[PDB]
Amino acid sequence: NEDLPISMENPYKEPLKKCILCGKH
Amino acid sequence: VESFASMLRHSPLTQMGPAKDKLVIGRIFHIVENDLYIDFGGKFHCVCRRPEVDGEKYQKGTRVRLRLLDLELTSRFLGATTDTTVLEANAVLLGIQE
Amino acid sequence: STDFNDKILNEPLKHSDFFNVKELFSVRSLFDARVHLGHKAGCRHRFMEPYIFGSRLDHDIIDLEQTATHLQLALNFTAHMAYRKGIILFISRNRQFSYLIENMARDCGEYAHTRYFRGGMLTNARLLFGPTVRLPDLIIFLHTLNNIFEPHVAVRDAAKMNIPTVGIVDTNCNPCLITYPVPGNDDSPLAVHLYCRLFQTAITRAKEKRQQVEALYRLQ
Amino acid sequence: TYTEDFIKKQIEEFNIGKRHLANMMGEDPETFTQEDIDRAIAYLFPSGLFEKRARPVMKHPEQIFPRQRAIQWGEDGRPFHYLFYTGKQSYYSLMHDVYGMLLNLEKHGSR
Amino acid sequence: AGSRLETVGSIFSRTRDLVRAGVLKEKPLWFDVYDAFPPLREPVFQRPRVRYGKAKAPIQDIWYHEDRIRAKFYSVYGSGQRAFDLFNPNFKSTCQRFVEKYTELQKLGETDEEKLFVETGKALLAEGVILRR
Amino acid sequence: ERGWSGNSWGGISLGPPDPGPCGETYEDFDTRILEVRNVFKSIRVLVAVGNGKGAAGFSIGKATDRMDAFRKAKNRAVHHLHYIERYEDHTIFHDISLRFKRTHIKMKKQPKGYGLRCHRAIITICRLIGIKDMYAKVSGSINMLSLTQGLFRGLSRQETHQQLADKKGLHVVEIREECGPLPIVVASPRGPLRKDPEPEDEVPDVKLDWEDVKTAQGMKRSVWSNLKRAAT
Ligand code: FES
Ligand SMILES: [Mg+2]
Ligand SMILES: [Mg+2]
């Protein structure tokens, strides 16, 4: 059956929250 | 014959995807003073406060616009093996459907 | 009385679907009634896992193919019990549907208990009603959980009193002690209305079938 | 405890005594009423006791005897009322009726 | 009367054993119906267990191919200003029409995710559906 | 007749259970006292009932008067009956090793005429159930209530030959030394027969008990074992 669900990582996963200084020296 | 898998795949609720910040249409089915109980097609209804603007227009059977925040409000608390549910959805009442 | 029994009480038991309960519902109808919508995975009960198709964005979905077979078995059992003039008691502590369930029970000539369940109604019935009281032959739970999200005491009491139980079990319910569990949504008004309609129709049709069979037997 | 046979007999004795009192007072037994019973008993058996219930009385046995016995199920065992197993079938039936009227209205000196 | 040990066996097994043992003179009204049409599972009491270690529930997450497209749509054009009508069994959102056009283009052309997205946007704008990025 | 001892309530018969409110008589049931204790005053009694044909149960009754406790325990016991499956209506279907709380009970199936060589409470409960041949050893804390609970649990959780045949889908064949190499099929599956045989496990990984092996090898020397006793 083509309508069966498929294994997959959550495509709606929101980007994980960042602190204001993340990526800065 | 249409299988349950096809029904779930092509269901509007499935198509909606995440329910956060989605505009939906609900229908008022019960009123308790200024508390409006609205069904929008989900498992649970949402309880909204009667707006101070054109509040008289909000009656049973009225179609309203809602911004869904959560389909069911649950939260696991300290020392609990299972989540505690209020059996209600979370939504914001925007207005009446013209 | 041997011919009476063999022709009326044993005849229905030789047919797979004697009361034709299969045409009362379909997977399409259950989907339209939102019977497939369960609770979130955080409230999931372990014993409800085999009945769950999957989780859609942390929301459990009840496999309606299994629900169809379970509902078929439960409705067949209910129809057969009503044909035998057994006492049928509906139980539900969801106050949103107490009026509907009481109306349905009155309509089909059966009994309802949507109020606070006192200690000993089933296990102490003789002291609470009288020494010659007759207990229900079948108990149907439209909601198997009480208002603190724990099992209705009537489930364990009926198990103690050897009374078969039919039950609507949501994803957060325990189906271990319900004789004929029916996985489905117990919150949405559409699903509850569908359950009430199906059970009322089955009971009424079973009683009418019994009456007409008795009339035919008397005529012949 | 008063058996139903006992109350039946007392009804019989009250009826025969009613006709007897009607004969004694010369009134027509056919139209003789309870007020007539009270007045005739007061006349024949005068009593100025202040307590009205301590004075002579010949009332219909139904009013005197507090015997009550209501059957809630038939010989087959099926209860008559659909709310029997609640244990308060009358109260919950009344509440159900009131709630139904409230639903209908929602769709639409004394103590 | 039957045994009140609800945690031992099931009501059917207890009733059957007591009937055969002679404790119960007559079978209950439901025994024959149960025997003719048994449930799928025998109703036996079991204590639910908390899982530990690597034991996990076998419940899978429900995902479809189009979900990816939906995500990107909901990330690029955002949530449609048009409201969802979940009561209609055949409601078509802007995202759903975008998905259908995307799949038709994929089946009638090549497989380049960005190109499919952009050309699908061009096609929807050509049809006359507003799409504000 | 005295119980286990002259001044002991244990083992004394209380007569048949009273006719229940349900309308059922229990003239074929016998009641035996298993324990009497003073609760500090009231009396707590543990009693067991059984008809001798597989139906048996036990209950606790608490009351200020001892006779009231007896009556309560008996009447509650008759409404919490177990059914115990018996192999040929004289013994158990297989050896049963159980531990309830801190009380260990090892029971062994035995041939006909072996008798009841078991704890006295176990002897009484077996007589109530109808078991005539069995061996039993109790270890750990000898607590009467725990002993009764473990005994009933283990006896109710025994698998019959028919159940094993249905589970494995194979003939369960009994071999008796007195009957030579004759194969006696005691159970056959109700469904179809599996055609592939059980794996011939060269050395099964079973958990053996040191007492049984020591007895089999003759290193057990106890002066208290295998002593001559009255028929039980
Ligand atoms: S959140 Fe990434 S460095 Fe702080
Ligand atoms: Mg629920
Ligand atoms: Mg002595």
Tab-separated table of C-alpha atoms in Angstrom, chain F residues 85-95 107-118 122-123 126-127 130-136 155 158 232:
chain	number	residue	atom	x	y	z
F	85	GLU	CA	-6.064	-28.714	38.138
F	86	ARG	CA	-5.158	-32.248	39.234
F	87	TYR	CA	-3.268	-34.822	37.187
F	88	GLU	CA	-5.480	-37.932	37.258
F	89	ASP	CA	-7.310	-36.337	40.211
F	90	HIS	CA	-4.622	-37.402	42.692
F	91	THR	CA	-1.524	-35.229	42.126
F	92	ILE	CA	-0.167	-32.103	40.441
F	93	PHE	CA	0.818	-31.906	36.780
F	94	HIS	CA	4.499	-31.059	37.373
F	95	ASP	CA	7.052	-29.892	39.916
F	107	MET	CA	6.467	-29.170	45.398
F	108	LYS	CA	7.082	-32.440	43.549
F	109	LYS	CA	4.610	-34.595	41.638
F	110	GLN	CA	4.543	-38.172	42.925
F	111	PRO	CA	3.081	-41.533	41.855
F	112	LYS	CA	-0.052	-43.073	43.312
F	113	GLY	CA	0.224	-44.352	46.874
F	114	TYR	CA	3.045	-41.950	47.755
F	115	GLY	CA	0.830	-40.025	50.178
F	116	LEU	CA	1.055	-36.443	51.395
F	117	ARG	CA	4.565	-35.812	52.745
F	118	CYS	CA	4.174	-32.067	53.171
F	122	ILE	CA	-0.114	-28.060	53.121
F	123	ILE	CA	-1.515	-31.486	54.029
F	126	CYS	CA	-4.304	-30.661	49.810
F	127	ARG	CA	-6.982	-32.731	51.539
F	130	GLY	CA	-8.359	-33.327	46.663
F	131	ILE	CA	-4.625	-33.836	46.062
F	132	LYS	CA	-3.603	-37.242	47.416
F	133	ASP	CA	0.047	-37.693	46.333
F	134	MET	CA	2.685	-34.949	46.458
F	135	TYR	CA	5.930	-33.993	48.177
F	136	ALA	CA	6.500	-30.486	49.528
F	155	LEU	CA	-1.258	-24.594	42.307
F	158	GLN	CA	0.167	-25.016	36.801
F	232	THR	CA	-1.660	-38.743	55.566
